């Protein structure tokens, strides 16, 4: 386009400026009054209380045949499971290892007997079942089953009685007032029930005729034919079987909280009314408010503190022995999300129930954010401090150089072509507007003062007004730049968009701007942004795949069996 030229008038001493005083450098007081220590994290215990028991029952089967012409149809098979009474358990089973053949029990509010094979009773020996792998023991008496035929046209009736003992795996959930066996039998009693030491307080539904409690009861092991060690044993007579399990006190068996993950090195920060238990090995951060948390608010939380002290004293021995020293007794905090953080502080040598969430990835994020947010803020503080220190040192360069070339330096500051002067200790400026069009610019030929040979000009004369050229398209109205007229005078001058070369105070040629090579005072810095992402809902297993691991589904089986008569029988028609 058209080249731009600037005209600087004689400066008026009106406008006056000075260089701003050095700014004070801000100090980001970053740093946290922290406290390191040892921590053990507990979670809600959801698993059922598992213990082992023993069922004692006989097995009464009444079969009714019908001897036909040439066959034998069974018209009835009534099967039942009756309990072995505890007088027979302690006197026949555990003394000798036998069981009687007579089955004495109670059905329909009457007292009923039944005989194996309708013979006289015998004490038949208990025999181990053939599938006794370890994990499921049993002992029966009779591999057979009795029924008879009789004469044709008639009925008969047999009865098989088979004493049965099984080891089971009983199982009970909170609040521990019923326990179900491994044979599908609910027992409506707490496993901790008993008649001594306050255990009668526990829940029951059976009448008290049925419960029987022993002490020092040496139970016979039916395999080795020996007696076990003495222990206190309960016995309960259900309408179908007899449970016997060794009594154990509630306080040392169940526990609301179970250990999740011990941590050798935490750091306890302090925010506004919150603590932060940054666990840098687990990459996890828990947050608790600044109070303690008394675990006596929680049902069954009496295994947490004492178990925690046994663990922390291991760690303080085996790792922090010489390095640190303790700072008082352990402290209990309720972490956000349902975690319980037992925390023992250190120092260098210098009621209800807690519900725990099923995912800790809220807390890995809290660490991952805080590990970045601490590190980014520290580096961004170090830029701003070193930026402020740079500019303050840079100011002395500016103020040191303004007596050399005042106009060009002030022009860079004010973003505007001005013409400054130094009036002592200040800067007095004056604007330089553009020169408009319709003006003939005539470059001269010689830089020599006419007549005076030894005196010559410094920058070329121009013919607008008969003035001379300035610098950066400034146009001096006068012709005052003179110098001694020195040989080997080889100069260039910026003019429009062409460097005009002079040799020996005479014109030679011109040359374009981009013909002249460049050196770069700029220092590069290629900072590049971050890209946008979309995190998809990646799920390792669907909910359908998490319900598809069992061998049977109870609701699925019952939707098929309970329409059996609808599918295979016409239930609507009646017969008159």
């Amino acid at each position: 386009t058209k080249p731009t030229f600037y005209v600087c008038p004689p400066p008026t001493g009106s406008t006056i400026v000075r260089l701003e005083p050095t700014r004070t450098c801000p100090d980001y007081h970053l740093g946290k009054n922290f406290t390191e220590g040892i921590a053990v994290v507990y979670k809600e215990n959801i698993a059922a209380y598992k213990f082992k028991a023993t069922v004692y029952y006989k097995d009464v089967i009444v079969s009714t045949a019908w001897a036909g012409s040439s066959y034998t149809q069974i018209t009835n098979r009534y099967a039942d499971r009756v309990p072995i009474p505890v007088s027979e358990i302690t006197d026949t089973i555990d003394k000798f290892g036998k069981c009687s053949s007579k089955a004495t029990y109670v059905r329909n509010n009457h007292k009923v007997e039944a005989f194996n094979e309708d013979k006289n009773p015998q004490d038949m020996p208990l025999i181990a079942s053939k599938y006794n792998s370890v994990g499921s023991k049993a002992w029966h008496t009779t591999n057979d089953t009795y029924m008879v035929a009789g004469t044709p046209g008639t009925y008969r009736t047999g009865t098989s009685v088979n004493c049965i003992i099984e080891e089971v795996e009983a199982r009970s959930i909170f609040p521990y007032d019923s326990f179900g066996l491994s044979t599908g039998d609910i027992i409506y009693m707490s496993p901790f029930f008993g008649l001594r030491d306050g255990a009668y307080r526990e829940h029951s539904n059976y009448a008290m005729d049925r419960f029987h409690q022993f002490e020092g009861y040496r139970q016979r092991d039916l395999d080795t034919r020996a007696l076990l060690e003495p222990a206190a044993r309960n016995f309960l007579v259900t309408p179908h079987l007899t449970v016997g399990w060794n009594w154990k006190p509630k306080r040392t068996e169940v526990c609301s909280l179970v250990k999740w993950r011990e941590v050798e090195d935490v750091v306890r920060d302090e925010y506004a009314h919150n603590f932060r238990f940054t666990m840098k090995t687990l990459s996890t951060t828990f947050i608790s408010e600044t109070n303690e948390f008394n675990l006596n608010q929680i049902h069954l939380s009496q295994c947490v503190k004492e178990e925690a002290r046994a663990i922390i004293n291991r760690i303080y021995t085996t790792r922090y022995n010489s390095s640190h020293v303790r700072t008082g007794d352990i402290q209990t905090y309720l972490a956000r999300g349902g975690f319980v953080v037992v925390f023992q502080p250190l120092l260098s040598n210098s009621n209800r129930t807690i519900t725990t969430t099923s995912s800790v990835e809220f807390a890995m994020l809290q660490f991952t954010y805080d590990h970045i947010q601490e590190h980014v803020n520290e580096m961004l503080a170090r830029i701003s401090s070193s930026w402020c220190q740079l500019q303050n040192r840079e100011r002395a360069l500016w103020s040191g150089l303004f007596p050399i070339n005042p106009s060009a330096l002030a022009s860079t500051i004010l973003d505007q072509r001005v013409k400054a002067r130094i009036l002592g200790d200040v800067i007095s400026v004056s604007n330089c507007p553009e020169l408009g069009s319709d003006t003939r610019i005539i470059l001269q030929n010689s830089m020599r003062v006419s007549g005076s040979t030894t005196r010559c000009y410094s920058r070329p004369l121009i013919s607008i007004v008969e003035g001379q050229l300035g610098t950066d398209n400034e146009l001096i109205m006068s012709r005052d730049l003179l110098e001694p007229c020195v040989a080997n005078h080889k100069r260039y001058f910026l003019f429009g968009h062409h460097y005009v070369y002079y040799e020996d105070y005479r014109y030679v040629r011109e040359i374009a701007v981009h013909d002249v090579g460049m050196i770069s005072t700029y220092v590069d810095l290629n900072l590049t942004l971050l890209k946008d992402r979309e995190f998809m809902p990646l799920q390792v297993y669907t909910r359908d795949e998490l319900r598809d691991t069992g061998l049977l589904d109870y609701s699925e089986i019952q939707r098929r069996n309970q329409m059996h008569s609808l599918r295979f029988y016409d239930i609507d028609k009646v017969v008159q």
Partner: antibody, heavy 122, light 107 residues
Framework: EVQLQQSGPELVKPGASVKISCKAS????????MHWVKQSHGKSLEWIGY????????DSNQKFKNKATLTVDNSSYTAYMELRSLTSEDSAVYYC???????????????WGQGTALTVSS | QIVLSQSPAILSASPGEKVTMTCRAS?????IYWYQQKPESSPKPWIY???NLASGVPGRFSGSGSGTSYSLTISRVEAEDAATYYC?????????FGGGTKLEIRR
């Protein structure tokens, strides 16, 4: 019927020992726990301890944890209570009482001895 | 050391009426019992399981209560009852008998 013969009266110097028997008759002896109490002269009743005649299991009141010891003759079906390190304050009518092995609600001291009487003086 | 206080120390009673006795427990007990003793004699098993009358006692007797309070009322007091009624428990080791009461006729 059920009868608990007992060793009868006894006078003893202090520091000595005694051995009071409670002979039983009328039931199968081996499956009934045999307890012991102390009734002082006009004072109340105090439990001592018992012994299971089958499994030789023993409880005792810890206030009487050193005064008494208990054993059972398997043959003649008696229960002996031997007292070591006597004092004057043991001048008291004692008893023995039958009790079931199971702690059920049907378990009480259903048969008592006639009551031996022991005095400690010179 | 579960102390059992049979509140009434000596319960006087004109023969024919009803009376009452209390056995007060420090902590709770599942089952309090009762035993009487005529003087210069052995005690007798009198009430087991806090309401069951023993085998061979008159039906005029009645024991009740639960928890820490336990009662004993005679429906019609008789002069053949001048006993020493103890209350008894085995729920806590050691078994502990009551202080005892002592009936009185009015004649």
């Amino acid at each position: 019927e059920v009868q608990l013969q007992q060793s009868g009266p006894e006078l003893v110097k202090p520091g000595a020992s005694v051995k009071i028997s409670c002979k039983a008759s009328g039931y199968t002896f081996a499956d009934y726990t045999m307890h012991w109490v102390k009734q002082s002269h006009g004072k109340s009743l105090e439990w001592i301890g018992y012994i299971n005649p089958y499994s030789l299991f023993i409880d005792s009141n810890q206030k009487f944890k050193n005064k008494a010891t208990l054993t059972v003759d398997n043959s003649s079906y008696t229960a002996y209570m031997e007292l070591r390190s006597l004092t004057s304050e043991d001048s008291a009518v004692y008893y023995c009482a039958r009790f079931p092995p199971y702690y059920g609600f049907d378990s009480h001291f259903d048969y008592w001895g006639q009551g031996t009487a022991l005095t400690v003086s010179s | 050391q579960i102390v059992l206080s049979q509140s009434p120390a000596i319960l006087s009673a004109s023969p024919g009426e009803k009376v009452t006795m209390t056995c007060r427990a420090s902590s709770s007990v599942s089952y309090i019992y009762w035993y009487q003793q005529k003087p210069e004699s052995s005690p007798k098993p009198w009430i087991y399981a806090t309401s069951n009358l023993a085998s061979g006692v008159p039906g005029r007797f009645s024991g009740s209560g639960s928890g820490t309070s336990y009662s004993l009322t005679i429906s019609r007091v008789e002069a053949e009852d001048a006993a020493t009624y103890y209350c008894q428990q085995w729920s806590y080791n050691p078994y502990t008998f009551g202080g005892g009461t002592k009936l009185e006729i009015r004649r």
